[PDB]
A paper describes a structure:
IMPα recognizes three types of cNLSs via two binding sites: the major binding site accommodates monopartite cNLSs, the minor binding site recognizes atypical cNLSs, while bipartite cNLSs simultaneously interact with both major and minor sites. We combined bioinformatic, biochemical, functional, and structural approaches to study this phenomenon, using polyomaviruses (PyVs) large tumor antigens (LTAs) as a model.
We addressed this issue by solving the crystal structures of IMPα2ΔIBB in complex with FITC‐labeled peptides encompassing MCPyV LTA NLSm (274‐PFSRKRKFGGS‐284) and NLSct (300‐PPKPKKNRE‐308), to resolutions of 2.30 and 2.55 Å, respectively. The MCPyV LTA NLSct peptide could be visualized exclusively within the IMPα2ΔIBB major binding site, with the minor site remaining empty. The P0–P6 positions were occupied by the same aas bound in the bipartite MCPyV LTA NLS crystal structure, however, only residues P300 to E308 could be built into the electron density. An additional hydrogen bond between the P3 site K305 residue and IMPα2ΔIBB N228 was also observed.
Author numbering:
A (entry chain A): 72 to 496
B (entry chain B): 300 to 308
The structure:
């Protein structure tokens, strides 16, 4: 009855003074915005229908028109930044926040969804949704003794919207809002639904991406053990966000990194560093590079878990981006490690793959590798074995590459290669 | 990363 309407018919119905005609026209608009392969959002906006839908949001006595207008506005707010801006300019934020308290769960869910889209536009609309006071009601919707009593889709939408209120970082979310949301996020992080877990881990990864004080908030809530556990998950939708969060945390201080190590994260990296998905491997190698840049006892915990052979493996066969992250890990390890640890690195077979990566067309990997070389050589001089290492770099065919690097565009490259070719070779 | 915006079909 309201399927395949024209925008002109929808306007005639909404401009009538008949609440039921307006309801049917709004349902027609919703169906047009929720089914058409390319919904006509721009024409709906041009017709001036957003203010009318926003007004319908406030019709407590006609819950159906509330629901239909909320759905239509949700779908308009799901488009371009300009269309979301059109929804916001109609006054929709406070109306949806008021609707969060509806006695009807489908309407409350639709309001949560609309606010999720609005906040997902970016930091400005996120902060505006927060200023209108959405966090209190949203969290009130989860103030139940057991989350399992809530409908799966309801909880999933609430979790995703909260994750969007934690998203984007220029500016980052207000600190008071983060402190107010984090407890509920931990509670969701201990829920059994995989979608809730994935979205909550993504929220944590948002909140851990930035300065060490934000990381300290998250780590003070005591979530690192659960993040490691989820790192062990069988579902990549759960392992990917968890790995992002752990890597972010290890970009912080050595003590936050130590919190990760203590939770048992390293035991998971033999799988992650051999994972069939390139992204998991790359982000695990980046996490490893931020761990090997830590203290010598943390490098020693990397060694004790048997992860140096896996780094050699990644450096030997992997996607080039993963291989570059591995080169970074090696240079950090050599820069901060003892002589015993660097000797162990050489004994594990680092030299040949490190050499083979000097045939690449990226200046930064070349610099990183040559610095790793200088460090390994410096450790060799403390033992008087620099000649052994030079012979080893010659048998793998590396001196030829360093010699060709003697004539390289970038200055640092040829300076480093000349210092090595002259000082050690 | 989850989609920032979602249409309800």
């Amino acid at each position: 009855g309201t399927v395949n309407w024209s925008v002109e018919d929808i306007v005639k119905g909404i401009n009538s003074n008949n609440l039921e005609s307006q309801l049917q026209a709004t349902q027609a608009a919703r169906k047009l915005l929720s089914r058409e392969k390319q919904p006509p959002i721009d024409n709906i906006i041009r017709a001036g229908l957003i203010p009318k839908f926003v007004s319908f949001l406030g019709k407590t006595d006609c819950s159906p028109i509330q629901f239909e207008s909320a759905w239509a506005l949700t779908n308009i707010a799901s488009g371009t930044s300009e269309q979301t801006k059109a929804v916001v300019d109609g006054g929709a934020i406070p109306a949806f926040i008021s609707l969060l308290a509806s006695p009807h769960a489908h309407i409350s869910e639709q309001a949560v969804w609309a606010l999720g889209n609005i906040a997902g536009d970016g930091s400005a609309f996120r902060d505006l949704v927060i200023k209108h006071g959405a966090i209190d009601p949203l969290l009130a919707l989860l103030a139940v003794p057991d989350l399992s009593t809530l409908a799966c889709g309801y909880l999933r939408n609430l979790t995703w919207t909260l994750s969007n209120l934690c998203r984007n970082k220029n500016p980052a979310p207000p600190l008071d809002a983060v402190e107010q949301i984090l407890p509920t996020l931990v509670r969701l992080l201990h829920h059994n639904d995989p979608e809730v877990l994935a979205d909550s881990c993504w929220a944590i990864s948002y909140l851990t991406d930035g300065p060490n004080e934000r990381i300290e908030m998250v780590v003070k809530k005591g979530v690192v053990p659960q993040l490691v556990k989820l790192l062990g998950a069988t579902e990549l939708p759960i392992v990917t966000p968890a790995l992002r969060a752990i890597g972010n945390i290890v970009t912080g201080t050595d003590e936050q990194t130590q919190k990760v190590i203590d939770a048992g994260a390293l035991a998971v990296f033999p799988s992650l560093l051999t994972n069939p998905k390139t992204n998991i491997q790359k982000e695990a190698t980046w996490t490893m590079s931020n761990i090997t840049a830590g203290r010598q006892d943390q490098i020693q915990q990397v060694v004790n878990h048997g992860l140096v052979p896996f780094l050699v493996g990644v450096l030997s066969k992997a996607d080039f981006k993963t291989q570059k992250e591995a080169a970074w890990a090696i240079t950090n390890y050599t820069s901060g490690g003892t002589v015993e640890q660097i000797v162990y690195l050489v004994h594990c077979g680092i030299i040949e793959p490190l050499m083979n990566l000097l045939s690449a067309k990226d200046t930064k990997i070349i610099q990183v590798i040559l610095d790793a070389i200088s460090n390994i050589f410096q450790a060799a001089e403390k033992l008087g074995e620099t000649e052994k290492l030079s012979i080893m770099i010659e048998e793998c065919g590396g001196l030829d590459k360093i010699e060709a690097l003697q004539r390289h565009e970038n200055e640092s490259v040829y300076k480093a290669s000349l210092n090595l070719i002259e000082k050690y070779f | 990363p989850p989609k920032p915006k979602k249409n309800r079909e």
